[PDB]
Amino acid sequence: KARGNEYQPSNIKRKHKHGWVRRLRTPTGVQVILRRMHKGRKSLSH
Amino acid sequence: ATSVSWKSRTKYTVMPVKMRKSGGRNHTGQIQVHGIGGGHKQRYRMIDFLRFRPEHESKPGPFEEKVIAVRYDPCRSADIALVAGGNRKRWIIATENMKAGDTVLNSDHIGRMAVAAREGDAHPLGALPVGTLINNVESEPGRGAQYIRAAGTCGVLLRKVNGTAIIQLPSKRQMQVLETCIATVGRVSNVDHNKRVIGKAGRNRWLGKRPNSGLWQRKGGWAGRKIRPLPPMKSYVKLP
Amino acid sequence: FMKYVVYPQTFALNADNWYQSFTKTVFLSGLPPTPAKLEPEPTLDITALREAVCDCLLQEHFFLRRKKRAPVIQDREAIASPFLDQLVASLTGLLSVHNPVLAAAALDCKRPVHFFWLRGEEIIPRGHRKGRVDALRYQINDKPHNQIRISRQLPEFVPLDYSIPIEVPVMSCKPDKLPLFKRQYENTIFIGSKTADPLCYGHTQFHLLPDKLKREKLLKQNCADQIEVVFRANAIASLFAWTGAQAMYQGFWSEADVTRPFVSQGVITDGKYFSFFCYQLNTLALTAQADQNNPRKNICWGTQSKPLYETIEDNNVKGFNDDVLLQLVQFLLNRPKED
Amino acid sequence: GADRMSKWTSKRGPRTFCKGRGAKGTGFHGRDGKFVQIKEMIPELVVPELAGFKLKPYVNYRAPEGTDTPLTAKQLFLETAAPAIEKDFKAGTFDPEHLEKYGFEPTQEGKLFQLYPKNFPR
Amino acid sequence: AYEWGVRSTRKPEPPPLDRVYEIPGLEPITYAGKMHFMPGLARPVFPPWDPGWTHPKFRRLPPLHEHPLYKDQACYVFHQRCRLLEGVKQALWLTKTQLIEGLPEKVLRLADDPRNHIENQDERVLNAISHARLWHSTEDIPKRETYCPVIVDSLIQLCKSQILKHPSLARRICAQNNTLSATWNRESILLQVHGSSGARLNAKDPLPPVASQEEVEATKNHVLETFYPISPTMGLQECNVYDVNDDTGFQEGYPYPCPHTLYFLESANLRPRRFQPDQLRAKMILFAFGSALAQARLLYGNDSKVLEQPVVVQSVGTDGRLFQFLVLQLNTTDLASDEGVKNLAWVDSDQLLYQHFWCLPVIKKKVVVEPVGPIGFQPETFRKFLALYLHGA
RNA sequence: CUCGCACACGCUUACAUCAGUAACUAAUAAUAUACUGAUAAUUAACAACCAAUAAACCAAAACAACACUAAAACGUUUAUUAAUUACAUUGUUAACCCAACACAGGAGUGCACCAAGGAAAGAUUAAAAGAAGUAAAAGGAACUCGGCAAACACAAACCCCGCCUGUUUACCAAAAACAUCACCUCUAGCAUUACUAGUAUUAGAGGCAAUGCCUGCCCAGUGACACCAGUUUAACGGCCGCGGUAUUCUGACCGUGCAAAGGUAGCAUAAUCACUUGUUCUCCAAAUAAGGACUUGUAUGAAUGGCCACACGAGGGUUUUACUGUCUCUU
RNA sequence: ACGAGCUACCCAUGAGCAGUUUAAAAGAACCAACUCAUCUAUGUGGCAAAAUAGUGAGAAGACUUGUAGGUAGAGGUGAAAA
RNA sequence: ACCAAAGCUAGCUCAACAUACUAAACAAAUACAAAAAUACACCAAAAUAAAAUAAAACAUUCACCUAACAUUAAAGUAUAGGA
Ligand SMILES: [Mg+2]
Ligand SMILES: [Mg+2]
Ligand SMILES: [Mg+2]
Ligand SMILES: [Mg+2]
Ligand SMILES: [Mg+2]
Ligand SMILES: [Mg+2]
Ligand SMILES: [Mg+2]
Ligand SMILES: [Mg+2]
Ligand SMILES: [Mg+2]
Ligand SMILES: [Mg+2]
Ligand SMILES: [Mg+2]
Ligand SMILES: [Mg+2]
Ligand SMILES: [Mg+2]
Ligand SMILES: [Mg+2]
Ligand SMILES: [Mg+2]
Ligand SMILES: [Mg+2]
Ligand SMILES: [Mg+2]
Ligand SMILES: [Mg+2]
Ligand SMILES: [Mg+2]
Ligand SMILES: [Mg+2]
Ligand SMILES: [Mg+2]
Numbered sequence A: 001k002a003r004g005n006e007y008q009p010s011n012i013k014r015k016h017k018h019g020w021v022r023r024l025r026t027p028t029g030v031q032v033i034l035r036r037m038h039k040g041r042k043s044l045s046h
Numbered sequence B: 001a002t003s004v005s006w007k008s009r010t011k012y013t014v015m016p017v018k019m020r021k022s023g024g025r026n027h028t029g030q031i032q033v034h035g036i037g038g039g040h041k042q043r044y045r046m047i048d049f050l051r052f053r054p055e056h057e058s059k060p061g062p063f064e065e066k067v068i069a070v071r072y073d074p075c076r077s078a079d080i081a082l083v084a085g086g087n088r089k090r091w092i093i094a095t096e097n098m099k100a101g102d103t104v105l106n107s108d109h110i111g112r113m114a115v116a117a118r119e120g121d122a123h124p125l126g127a128l129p130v131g132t133l134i135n136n137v138e139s140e141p142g143r144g145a146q147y148i149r150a151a152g153t154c155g156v157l158l159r160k161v162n163g164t165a166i167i168q169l170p171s172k173r174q175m176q177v178l179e180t181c182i183a184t185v186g187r188v189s190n191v192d193h194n195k196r197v198i199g200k201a202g203r204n205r206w207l208g209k210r211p212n213s214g215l216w217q218r219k220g221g222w223a224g225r226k227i228r229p230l231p232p233m234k235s236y237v238k239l240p
Numbered sequence C: 001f002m003k004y005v006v007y008p009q010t011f012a013l014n015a016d017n018w019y020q021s022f023t024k025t026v027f028l029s030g031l032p033p034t035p036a037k038l039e040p041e042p043t044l045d046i047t048a049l050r051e052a053v054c055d056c057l058l059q060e061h062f063f064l065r066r067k068k069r070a071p072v073i074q075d076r077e078a079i080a081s082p083f084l085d086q087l088v089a090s091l092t093g094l095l096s097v098h099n100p101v102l103a104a105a106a107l108d109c110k111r112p113v114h115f116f117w118l119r120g121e122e123i124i125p126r127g128h129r130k131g132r133v134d135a136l137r138y139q140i141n142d143k144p145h146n147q148i149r150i151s152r153q154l155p156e157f158v159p160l161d162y163s164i165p166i167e168v169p170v171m172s173c174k175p176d177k178l179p180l181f182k183r184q185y186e187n188t189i190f191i192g193s194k195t196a197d198p199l200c201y202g203h204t205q206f207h208l209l210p211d212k213l214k215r216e217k218l219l220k221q222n223c224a225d226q227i228e229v230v231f232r233a234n235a236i237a238s239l240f241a242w243t244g245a246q247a248m249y250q251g252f253w254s255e256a257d258v259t260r261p262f263v264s265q266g267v268i269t270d271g272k273y274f275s276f277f278c279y280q281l282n283t284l285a286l287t288a289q290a291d292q293n294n295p296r297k298n299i300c301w302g303t304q305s306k307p308l309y310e311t312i313e314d315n316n317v318k319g320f321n322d323d324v325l326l327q328l329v330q331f332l333l334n335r336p337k338e339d
Numbered sequence D: 001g002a003d004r005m006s007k008w009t010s011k012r013g014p015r016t017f018c019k020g021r022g023a024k025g026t027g028f029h030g031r032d033g034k035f036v037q038i039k040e041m042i043p044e045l046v047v048p049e050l051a052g053f054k055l056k057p058y059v060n061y062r063a064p065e066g067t068d069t070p071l072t073a074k075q076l077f078l079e080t081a082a083p084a085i086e087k088d089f090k091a092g093t094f095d096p097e098h099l100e101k102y103g104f105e106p107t108q109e110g111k112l113f114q115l116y117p118k119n120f121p122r
Numbered sequence E: 001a002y003e004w005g006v007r008s009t010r011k012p013e014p015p016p017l018d019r020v021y022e023i024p025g026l027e028p029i030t031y032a033g034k035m036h037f038m039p040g041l042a043r044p045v046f047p048p049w050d051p052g053w054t055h056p057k058f059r060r061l062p063p064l065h066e067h068p069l070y071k072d073q074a075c076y077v078f079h080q081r082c083r084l085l086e087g088v089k090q091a092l093w094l095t096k097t098q099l100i101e102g103l104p105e106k107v108l109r110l111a112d113d114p115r116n117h118i119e120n121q122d123e124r125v126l127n128a129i130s131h132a133r134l135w136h137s138t139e140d141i142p143k144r145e146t147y148c149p150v151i152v153d154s155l156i157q158l159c160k161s162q163i164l165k166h167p168s169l170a171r172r173i174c175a176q177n178n179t180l181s182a183t184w185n186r187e188s189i190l191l192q193v194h195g196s197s198g199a200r201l202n203a204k205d206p207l208p209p210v211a212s213q214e215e216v217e218a219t220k221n222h223v224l225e226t227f228y229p230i231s232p233t234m235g236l237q238e239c240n241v242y243d244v245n246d247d248t249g250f251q252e253g254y255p256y257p258c259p260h261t262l263y264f265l266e267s268a269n270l271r272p273r274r275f276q277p278d279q280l281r282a283k284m285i286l287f288a289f290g291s292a293l294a295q296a297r298l299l300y301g302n303d304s305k306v307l308e309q310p311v312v313v314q315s316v317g318t319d320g321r322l323f324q325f326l327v328l329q330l331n332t333t334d335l336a337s338d339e340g341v342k343n344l345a346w347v348d349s350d351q352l353l354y355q356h357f358w359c360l361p362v363i364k365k366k367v368v369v370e371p372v373g374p375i376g377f378q379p380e381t382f383r384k385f386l387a388l389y390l391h392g393a
Numbered sequence F: 001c002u003c004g005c006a007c008a009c010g011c012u013u014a015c016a017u018c019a020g021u022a023a024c025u026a027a028u029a030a031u032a033u034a035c036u037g038a039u040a041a042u043u044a045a046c047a048a049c050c051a052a053u054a055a056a057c058c059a060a061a062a063c064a065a066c067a068c069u070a071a072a073a074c075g076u077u078u079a080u081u082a083a084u085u086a087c088a089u090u091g092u093u094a095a096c097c098c099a100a101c102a103c104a105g106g107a108g109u110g111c112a113c114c115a116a117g118g119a120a121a122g123a124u125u126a127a128a129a130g131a132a133g134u135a136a137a138a139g140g141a142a143c144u145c146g147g148c149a150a151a152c153a154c155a156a157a158c159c160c161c162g163c164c165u166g167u168u169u170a171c172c173a174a175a176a177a178c179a180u181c182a183c184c185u186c187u188a189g190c191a192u193u194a195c196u197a198g199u200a201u202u203a204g205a206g207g208c209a210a211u212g213c214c215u216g217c218c219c220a221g222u223g224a225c226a227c228c229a230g231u232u233u234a235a236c237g238g239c240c241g242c243g244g245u246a247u248u249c250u251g252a253c254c255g256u257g258c259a260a261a262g263g264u265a266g267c268a269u270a271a272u273c274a275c276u277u278g279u280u281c282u283c284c285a286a287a288u289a290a291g292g293a294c295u296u297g298u299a300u301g302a303a304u305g306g307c308c309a310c311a312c313g314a315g316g317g318u319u320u321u322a323c324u325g326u327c328u329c330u331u
Numbered sequence G: 001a002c003g004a005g006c007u008a009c010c011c012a013u014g015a016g017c018a019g020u021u022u023a024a025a026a027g028a029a030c031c032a033a034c035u036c037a038u039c040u041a042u043g044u045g046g047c048a049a050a051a052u053a054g055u056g057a058g059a060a061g062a063c064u065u066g067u068a069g070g071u072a073g074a075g076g077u078g079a080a081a082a
Numbered sequence H: 001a002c003c004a005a006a007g008c009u010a011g012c013u014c015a016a017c018a019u020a021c022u023a024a025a026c027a028a029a030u031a032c033a034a035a036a037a038u039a040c041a042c043c044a045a046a047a048u049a050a051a052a053u054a055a056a057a058c059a060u061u062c063a064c065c066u067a068a069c070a071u072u073a074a075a076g077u078a079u080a081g082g083a
């Protein structure tokens, strides 16, 4: 019915989907971290 | 991610072990079989299909056991029976007229004389008369009863030639195996399973059958009444 | 609504005084005045009672063969709890001949006692309800080791309007620094049974101290004066909750203040030591709007700790105190009035 | 959405997430679910006697300082072991096989406070 | 056959060794020098790690044959929660006793005598039942694990209330969780009742024998019924480490030596977790037999002989509302041969204290059809319990 | 006037005290839980972390006495090892979360319906038009596509379509669509991750829809088995012309031709091309509306299923009263 | 490359359905909590990038719902609404 | 008269040279859900580049298109091309 509230916060889900261990457990996430470091991001992951 | 199967249990247990159903999902997570999922919570009763299984290797002779209870099993369409003999109990597939407090004999001896086949007996195909009704038939000696198990289904022994037994399966197909294969005489319990009626669409969901898709598919060449010849005999005896 | 959870067996340093502030009860050292109008009844067998007590000691300490306890520390919980149960049962059975009430009494084994009351006011400091007056609520959920419940109430110790020069200690501080913490759950008033139980009165309570409140534990924590304070707080909380449950089962509450005092006896037992308390509830109007002109105060009579045995060794009891046994005998032989 | 620049601490998590603030553990978990604390694991603060110690946290201002000469291995050897080895060599008693008497240690695993493994906190 | 293990969930086989390790006289180059894994180097093989200093918590479990008490002959242990297939039948076979339906004559005479009754018997029993089922807990419907011990202790206190009239019950004391060990060899089978019971009442004075010599001699002509397909050791724990020692719950010089009554409680919320009445009766038979064996072997000796003074023990099992009473008289010790005298047992079974209890008032068609309280009440079960309690005096 | 207390998840100090608000935030002031500065705070008993290895163990939870089918989470005991010695670490505020906002929206659980929470109106006048509510003479659907809305009623019936409960186009379509029990086909004689820890009374790929009467003809074409013949339509799908004839309308009948058969039973102006407002009867004073009959519908038709039937439906049409501002005609 | 914290469907673990008629916990009936959204009127840069009020259907089941996980685009899932 | 407008600086870009090429800080913790001292393992992996465009369409073809051999000529020559 009403949209826009699709983001229901959850720390466990956030850390299991975009956490550091989740990023590093796959080579694609490692490449994502490499791209963020090359760009100079202050926060690489959650 | 990859899921782990629930069947991690090496030791045999009489008590029902809890099982994790998976609806059409393989180890990857994609649907491989459609129309499965959302069933009722069930436990698994460990069934010993190898009927002739002596307790101790010191005495390999035929052994007699006693039926304790005939109970319902949600996993299969048949009704199972707890049978105790020696120092251990086990679940087996109950035949048609097995009741609580019955005698069961399990033998592998073959002689020139056929044994009077009762309903609870488990004798090799070579020791049974030429035209008996059998179930839980075996492929290779010692392999185990993979074949007939469903409620009310039973094959028929046809003939024994050259140390080799031929049976007729419920699909009216002839199966050739060694005469040493252990089989149980009689029909499987719950013969009225074919005559049961599902009262509503909810009973299918209780059994765990998701409704079919609504996509209308036009019938192809596969559709129609295909009158085929009977397939040739399936033989498992490895001729040298 | 929100309420404090008051624990009888507490680890706070000086919690007896805080419990007195919460309860409006005054603590008097020593036994209450003895009603010397008694008949020459106590001709019992002191030797037989000593034999029974020593047999219980030896059975729960050396005779009873249990499973091999790998921790060599030999925790006194599993050593004293069955001992306390068997001692209570044996004493009740032996003294029931002299006291017919104990035969008709019911013995509760580790059955909870719940009480919930109000005391004073408090302006809400934080939240959207800041600046409004909220009454302080307290709840006691005790688990006495052994309880004795009877049919008729025991007689009072002092009259209803008995006055004491000693005043209740009042704290110029919040209860959260005891420390106490607020919690919200079901606030039940429970005596040991439901209201339909014909035994709406009781006789005596038994409380076994936990391993957390051991004398050696307190000494290692550098607490010597708090050994008696632990007993005082336990008795003050438990007996008051028990008498309040009795009064509110009889039908008295803040606006229906109690007409006849409710008396209570309590025995608190460590692994080795014993202590005895007597509590008399007279006033139940502890709320702010009814305590404005309330002169009556609750009274708790207390006794100092006193050991029963001394380093029993190899099925032989070395030391024994007959005065503790006599005090237990008097507590169990106190009888309701006959009419 | 949620914040990423703030540090991930124990306050911003569920009940099942309870992370320490950096303190060292003092024991383990026993049998009945309780925590068993080991007295060997807690740091024992070795404090000296300051009653007869005639030293103050501050120095006299009129007192002079010194030229910065950091201590080094060669200087320490010269102050400690060089005179002894020199005396032994002059007397002819110097033994290259055994140098333990001059303060040298063959292995570190023997003594209590070891250097390379750094068994002492401070 | 059909192996019950699955290759996907079983422990994986170690990966095949690198091709370097099959070359004779060649030293593989691995990553063990850098203490971390790096591709391109061979997999190092490590010897079994040996913790020269043994740690209690983090060491491997010692094998069973290393234990000093390990013995070759497997003993069939019966512990507290053992289940028996043919409960009464296997119990009788393993214990060598003859079963009797009714309670003993002296028990009946003590029970049916109105003089030994309580002042207000029916009212006190109803009050105890109501307190146990409803009043003892703040919850509306208390659980069986709660109201089974409560009702058992309430009945015990009701029986104790008769000590005023009978000044002989003071010779008894209760006991909780005491180890019982009674091992015997029967028909070349080493059985051992070993474990702990719910509650145990002990007394200074022995319980007089109840079986008469006529019944004892008639027991000689009785034959124990046999079950062929099932072995007598069904449901027992086959153990290889044990001690052949008659260890009762107490040490020597105990003041209350003779066990009077065992108390068993089926305090479990689930029917599968509870015992069947048959299995409960078997458990009581075996535990009373173990206690009687301990007493007989501490009084007379370890020799296998017929007892001129039989040892009689009592037991009560409580499901919460169903009571099973048992009086077992051990008369012989030699159980290897089946041609001798058999022990005796009176098993009074399926005794309902009350039919049903309604914790809440059931309302049908806007009216109360049945009020709060137990529907159906059989005081005879309580009378038998009181007779068992007062059997000593 | 009554959505209040607490906990879980989530936000991080937005919480408390003092001081200031000319301006910054409140959609405006007063002042301040929402702005600024300074100082303090949430103290564990509630919660997180809190044994393994073998063996005895089929007997449901629903007041559980004992039973039903869909067969059902939730446990002890025994034996071997489980550092043994106070006080460990962590969450404790809030008027708060997700919606760009101090948003009439979306939010799990335990308690009671107030003993707790708040204010519809910034101040006037009382124009039109608009939204909401109440009441109404006589009439009582005459208004309108439709009785939509409203109403002092809140009933009885007749048809079409789907058996029924249910699901669907989040955000213009909730249905006559899908699914459904039932009935039919086809595809498989079998082992360690789906199917399945199952074995043809089984498991998949599908069609049509309970039940009752039934499902008529055809392998000529295209598919599928058979590796060619031959079998299959509850497979894809098709089931006729021309002309004269009984006594005038018709054609029982005959001649001839092509086909694999030439549309059987049933129903019928239908949700069924156009002619159509087909003809006739009932209902109304009037009817292209509704229902019942006639019926070549040369483009109806039998599991892409054909016919009736109970119950059912916010599905689509038609009536009888009762009801009323829908309307006469608004106030 | 990143997405199943919304939604489609599953997998583990939990929680809810008060009252009334009924031998019934009958994919029964009335009506609450709860879940959907039939009709109308406002709203149409609004309270709202789908709402409010009135009125409706289900309401012991093919029912809702909390937490965690999985199926990722030449695909997933789908009681087919492309 | 408000609103306003104007500075010359921070710094950037293109090259050349150049040591030879992942800057500084790393006391403690950092791939448990990162900044959380501490327990009997599993660790790991490779299989062509495609198309948008041009040929006025589009199927064969379409340089450069993250692979060192640079410069002056041979030479836009021989050849390869739905030629
Ligand atoms: Mg958004
Ligand atoms: Mg199945
Ligand atoms: Mg079945
Ligand atoms: Mg289907
Ligand atoms: Mg379909
Ligand atoms: Mg962000
Ligand atoms: Mg947290
Ligand atoms: Mg929290
Ligand atoms: Mg501690
Ligand atoms: Mg925020
Ligand atoms: Mg302002
Ligand atoms: Mg501020
Ligand atoms: Mg708070
Ligand atoms: Mg206004
Ligand atoms: Mg107006
Ligand atoms: Mg109006
Ligand atoms: Mg009106
Ligand atoms: Mg009017
Ligand atoms: Mg009209
Ligand atoms: Mg008109
Ligand atoms: Mg209407």
Ligand SMILES: [Mg+2]
Residues within 6 Å of the ligand: none
């Ligand atoms: Mg109407």
Ligand SMILES: [Mg+2]
Residues within 6 Å of the ligand: F153, F154, F155
């Ligand atoms: Mg009407």
Ligand SMILES: [Mg+2]
Residues within 6 Å of the ligand: F160
């Ligand atoms: Mg029509």
Ligand SMILES: [Mg+2]
Residues within 6 Å of the ligand: F162
């Ligand atoms: Mg429908």
Ligand SMILES: [Mg+2]
Residues within 6 Å of the ligand: F164, F311
């Ligand atoms: Mg129907």
Ligand SMILES: [Mg+2]
Residues within 6 Å of the ligand: none
């Ligand atoms: Mg769906």
Ligand SMILES: [Mg+2]
Residues within 6 Å of the ligand: none
């Ligand atoms: Mg929807």
Ligand SMILES: [Mg+2]
Residues within 6 Å of the ligand: F169
């Ligand atoms: Mg829509």
Ligand SMILES: [Mg+2]
Residues within 6 Å of the ligand: F174
């Ligand atoms: Mg609808």
Ligand SMILES: [Mg+2]
Residues within 6 Å of the ligand: F174
């Ligand atoms: Mg709609």
Ligand SMILES: [Mg+2]
Residues within 6 Å of the ligand: none
């Ligand atoms: Mg349909």
Ligand SMILES: [Mg+2]
Residues within 6 Å of the ligand: F183
């Ligand atoms: Mg049919």
Ligand SMILES: [Mg+2]
Residues within 6 Å of the ligand: none
């Ligand atoms: Mg049909």
Ligand SMILES: [Mg+2]
Residues within 6 Å of the ligand: none
């Ligand atoms: Mg047909």
Ligand SMILES: [Mg+2]
Residues within 6 Å of the ligand: F219
């Ligand atoms: Mg064909």
Ligand SMILES: [Mg+2]
Residues within 6 Å of the ligand: F219
């Ligand atoms: Mg053909």
